[PDB]
Amino acid sequence: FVPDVPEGYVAVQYAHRLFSSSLANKRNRVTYTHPPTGMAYPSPTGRPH
């Protein structure tokens, strides 16, 4: 079994560029900037599929 990828998901090549340090609520988060829209996401939760 290989789980099928759900309809809403966007494919993203990994790159060192995608992740960075950033300030967010008084700590340095491992932010993931998201290439389709460019939104930064300091928290692991709440990120786009």
Partner 1 sequence: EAFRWSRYFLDELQLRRLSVGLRLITNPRIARRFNGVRIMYLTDDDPDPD
Other C-beta atoms within 10 Å of 29: how many? 17
16 vs 26, beta carbon nearer partner 1: 26
Residue 24 carries which DSSP code?
-
- Interacting residue ranges for partner 1, rule: CB under 8 A: 24-25, 43, 45
Question: For the stretch 5-16, what's the b/e string if a residue is b when 16 or more beta carbons lie within 10 angstroms of its beta carbon?
Answer: eeeeeeeeeeee
User: Shortest Cβ distance from residue 34 to partner 1 (Å)?
Assistant: 18
User: Shortest Cβ distance from residue 30 to partner 1 (Å)?
Assistant: 14
6 vs 44, beta carbon nearer partner 1: 44
